[PDB]
Design a protein around this nucleic acid. Structure first.
Lengths: 181, 187
DNA sequence: GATCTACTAGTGATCT
DNA sequence: AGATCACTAGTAGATC
């Protein structure tokens, strides 16, 4: 039950010239909170049928899992590779990714074990060989942080609530003028 | 597509890259009221930008934790200055205009100051840079990263304060650990 | 107030 | 150096 509040955080830019934040739990325990308090916009990554840390990638607002730039999607799976017991030396390794929302906490939760509400929403992409330059490019953007996971999620939800409120009020405002017209 | 008009709480956010591949967040309040909260809830790591002796919005730049105003990459600092210029009513066309920048922490608001008016605790910590002419190729790049969001500024600052306190706790814990290991060393 | 029970937790030690 | 693990050591309800 080690607090070990430390979470690794990275930054990966795209050839689309969009910057994306990718985060990893230092701890197999810490991961549990990442799971407890992860966001709708997060995409979960792990090696299939092997043990690895749990790299996550956070999409920009309103983005969808398929929209991941391929260069960016590549950065996540390489990371999950080097931070796998067997991956760091294995070639042709298989990484699974799914949205945080498709993750379901098993009753035999253990540590480092998750399920998926719908296996169809599980996607797979394969890593062929160790690629040191992705890793070293990432390490320069690595930083250690001690977040209040629960707090940050609420913030996002709040921003969202206000964003919907503005959308919905402008929507109901329009029917007001149309009823008169 | 961010297809939204105007509603109180709207804050623009942009993104600018570094040659070392560190990404920086730039955020701006175009609005006189909006500006005021950005001023209340700004961060220690924020750098404030404005056109000199001219009316302009309040562009802010957020450094990574523990980064310092002098180490600001020139590429990014220029993107801030080009923004506050283009979001200046006369600046958007003026050549050889002066932008002042200072950390948010150096910002001071006296009882004389009304809404959208700010001062500087220390004039020494105020810096200046002049931009010569519009360089739309920058602005086109920055607009591609524009996003509108209605944050709970008070909340987000607190989140950051919390991480910091957590980082202090952790440091203190490892000290207590090492101090413990030393007592054992000869007992 | 006195055991009593059940829970964190700080300490030692032995696996990988 | 690190983590699981293993007794002791201590705190919290709670309980009669």
């Amino acid at each position: 039950h080690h607090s070990s509040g430390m979470v690794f955080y990275f930054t990966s830019s795209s050839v689309n010239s969009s910057a994306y934040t990718i985060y990893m739990g230092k701890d197999k325990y810490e991961n549990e909170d990442l799971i407890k308090h992860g966001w709708p916009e997060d995409i979960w990554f792990h090696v299939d049928k092997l043990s690895s840390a749990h790299v996550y990638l956070r999409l920009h607002k309103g983005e969808n899992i398929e929209d991941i730039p391929k260069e960016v999607l590549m950065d996540c799976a390489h990371l999950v590779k080097a931070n796998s017991i067997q991956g760091c030396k294995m070639n042709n390794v298989n990484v699974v990714y799914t949205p945080w929302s498709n993750l379901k906490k098993t009753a035999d939760m253990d540590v480092g074990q998750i399920g998926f509400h719908r296996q169809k929403d599980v996607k797979i992409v394969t890593v062929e060989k160790k690629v040191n330059e992705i890793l070293n490019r990432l390490e320069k953007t690595k930083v250690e942080r001690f977040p209040d996971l629960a707090a940050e999620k609420e913030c996002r939800d709040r921003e969202e609530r206000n964003e919907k409120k503005a959308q919905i009020q402008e929507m109901k405002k329009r029917e007001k003028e149309e009823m008169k017209k």
